């Protein structure tokens, strides 16, 4: 408790000097979890990012500097087993690590041999999907996004459907196609409905888009038939990643009535590799937007349940040397919180499991430079985006690399998410 609070102290610094870079994502205050391997050891194992390096948790446990309840949960291809140990475990590990990485601590700092083994450069590492995802659910909880999208489908006056302000609507996504940052994404072929022709055609998607989102990861499940209350919801959440829900919008338009988006979504979803713990995000909790009408009782919660997470997306054409930023927004603008989303997810009795992934829905902000999709940013191509380094984009083109990035900004430091990147491959011919 008091130990947990010390790990959030902005004044703390690490003897890993790169960790003290004021704009770096991996401050000693962060300590996110991932799954890595390296050139010396291709076995996947649990790692914690610090500065430009990674702490090998299995190595620290073997040396006796790190203990979890008693096979090692740190020698695993996924974080599931360690997450399943519960929140007391996550915090114990976080406090031990924070102590050991602290500049005033000598236990690991001054052990050159163990430090030469237990700390690995990210430049030497392979980062893998951090969890084995039992289920992936995606919501739609940005009022600005639903307004922007709905305005094109109807008009500003009728942008929002009545159920949208009564529930955090969502759908099951495809867990199998969630891939880690860096995985190339192939432009899908599919059925396209052209405005001139009576019957659909088969061809390459012409409206390939991102969806800027976050995903939170379930740390404690719930039994089938047993809802999670809104007040209890956040205690079930382990942490967060960045999430790009790649969308083929022309494929979506033709297939989606009435059972929802399907092939247009499931060809690829990318997440960042580092799970930033919900505890690490506590210093950035802020007041969520005001809801009108007041939702039904089961969706209500007192206090603050939004999080101040700066988000950015860059797009780099294949021939470009530098990427151009195409949007900047914040997770704090979402109309429905994670607590409310999970509460609604389970209100009818659906169960959840450790490692489940819950996408926020496209995060769109107040200003025209803060929308979370090219569909919004270019208003369906009516005003193509002029790229800072050169070129124009309506939707994504072949060889474009799309990079999501995110951080919480504190006083003199950051708690950041790394990157969620993918580069588009030409459709199959």
* Residues identified as active-site: 145
Residue from 81, 356, 376, 401 that binds a second copy (CB under 8 A)? 356
Residue 406 binds: one of Na ion, Mg ion, a second copy, none (C-beta under 5 to 8 A by kind):
none
Picked from Na ion, a second copy, Mg ion, none, the partner binding residue 211 (CB below 5 to 8 A depending on kind) is Mg ion
Whole-Å CA distances, 365 to 147, 238, 240, 241, 371: 11, 25, 19, 19, 6
Among all residues, whose Cβ is closest to Mg ion?
Answer: 245
- Interface residue with Na ion among 25, 213, 245, 356 (CB under 5 A) is 245
**Smallest gap from residue 152 Cβ to a second copy (A):** 12
Backbone angles phi, psi at 424, to 5 degrees: -85, 130
Choose which of 25, 56, 144, 211 interacts with Mg ion (CB under 5 A): 211
- Binding status of residue 188 toward a second copy by CB under 8 A: yes
CB < 8 Å & 24+ apart, contacts of 112-119 = 114/59, 114/60, 114/63, 114/65, 117/56, 117/59, 118/55, 118/56, 118/59, 118/60, 118/63, 119/16, 119/50, 119/53, 119/54, 119/55, 119/56
Strand partners, 359: 138, 215
397 is in an annotated binding site: no
160 makes contact with a second copy (CB under 8 A): no
The option from Na ion, Mg ion, a second copy, none interacting with 269 (CB < 5 to 8 A, set by class) reads Na ion
Eight-class DSSP state of 186: E
Handedness of CA 55, 57, 58, 62 (dihedral sign): positive
Q: What gap in Å lies between CA 162 and CA 92, rounded to an integer?
A: 45
Query: Cβ closer to a second copy: 121 or 300?
Result: 300
- In sequence order, the β-bridge partners of residue 119 are 55
The mark string for 269-288 relative to Na ion (x by CB under 5 A, - otherwise) is: x-------------------
Identify which range of 62-70, 71-79, 251-259, 262-270 contacts Na ion by CB under 5 A: 262-270
Site for Mg ion in 218-257 (CB under 5 A): 245
Cα 66-133-231 angle, rounded to 5 deg: 80
Q: Among residues 353, 384, 409, 423, which is the contact residue for a second copy, using CB under 8 A?
A: 353
Tokens matching residue 229: 């209350």
Cβ 370 vs Cβ 384: under 8 Å:
no
Largest CA distance in the chain: 73
Is 124 annotated to bind ligand? Answer: no
Binding to a second copy (CB under 8 A) within 105-144 occurs at: 134-135, 140
Q: How far is the CB of 261 from Na ion (least distance, A)?
A: 8
- C-alpha span between 140 and 168 (Å, rounded): 7
Angle at 129 between CA 184 and CA 223, to 5 degrees: 130
**Site mask, a second copy, residues 266-285, x = CB under 8 A?**
xxx-----------------
Contacts of 201 (CB under 8 A, 6+ apart): 191, 192, 193, 194
With CB under 8 A as the contact rule, the residue among 194, 235, 287, 296 that binds a second copy is 296
Residue ranges binding Na ion (CB under 5 A): 245-246, 265, 269
Residue ranges binding Mg ion (CB under 5 A): 138, 211, 245
Binding residues: 138, 140, 154, 211, 213, 245, 252, 256, 265, 269, 362
Residue ranges binding a second copy (CB under 8 A): 134-135, 140, 161, 163, 166-167, 169-177, 179, 186, 188-191, 193, 199-202, 205, 224-225, 227, 248, 251, 254-264, 266-268, 293, 296-298, 344-345, 347-353, 356, 425, 428
């Amino acid at each position: 408790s008091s130990d947990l609070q010390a790990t959030l102290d902005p004044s703390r610094k690490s003897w890993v000097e790169s960790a003290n870079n004021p704009t770096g994502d991996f401050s000693i205050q962060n300590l996110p979890f991932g799954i890595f391997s390296d050139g010396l050891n291709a076995t996947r194992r649990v790692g914690v990012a610090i500065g430009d390096s990674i702490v090998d948790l299995a190595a620290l446990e073997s040396a006796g500097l790190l203990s979890v309840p008693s096979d090692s949960v740190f020698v695993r291809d996924a974080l599931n087993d360690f997450i399943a140990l519960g929140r007391d475990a996550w915090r114990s590990v976080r406090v031990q690590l924070s102590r050991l990485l602290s500049r005033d601590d000598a236990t690991l700092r001054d052990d050159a041999e163990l430090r030469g083994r237990a700390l690995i450069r990210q430049a030497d590492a392979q980062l893998h999907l951090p969890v084995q995802i039992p289920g992936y659910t995606d919501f739609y909880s940005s009022k600005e996004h639903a307004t922007n999208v709905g305005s094109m489908f109807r008009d500003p006056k009728n942008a929002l459907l009545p159920n949208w302000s009564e529930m955090p609507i969502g759908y099951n996504g495809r867990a199998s196609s969630v891939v880690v940052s860096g995985t190339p994404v192939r432009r899908p072929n599919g059925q396209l409905k052209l405005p001139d022709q009576e019957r659909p055609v088969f061809g390459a998607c012409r409206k390939l888009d991102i969806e800027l989102e976050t995903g939170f990861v379930i740390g404690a499940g719930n039994a089938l038939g047993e809802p999670v209350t809104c007040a209890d919801a956040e205690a079930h959440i382990f942490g967060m990643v960045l999430l790009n829900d790649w969308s083929a919008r022309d494929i979506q338009q033709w297939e989606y009535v009435p059972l929802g988006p399907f092939n247009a979504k499931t060809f690829a979803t990318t997440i960042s590799p580092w799970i930033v713990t919900l505890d690490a995000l506590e210093p950035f909790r802020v007041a969520q937007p005001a809801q009108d009408p007041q939702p039904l009782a089961y969706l209500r919660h007192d206090g603050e349940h939004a999080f101040d997470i700066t988000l950015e997306v860059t797009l780099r054409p294949q021939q470009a040397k530098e990427a151009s930023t195409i949007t900047r927004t914040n997770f704090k603008h979402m109309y429905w919180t994670m607590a409310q989303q999970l509460a609604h997810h389970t209100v009818s009795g659906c169960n959840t499991r450790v490692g489940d992934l819950m996408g926020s829905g496209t995060i769109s902000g107040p200003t025209e430079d803060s929308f979370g999709s090219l569909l919004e940013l270019t208003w369906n191509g009516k005003k193509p985006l002029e790229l800072r380094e050169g070129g124009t984009r309506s939707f994504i083109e072949d060889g474009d690399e799309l990079t999501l990035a995110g951080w919480c900004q504190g006083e003199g430091y950051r708690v950041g998410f790394g990157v969620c990147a993918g580069e588009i491959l030409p459709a199959l011919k």
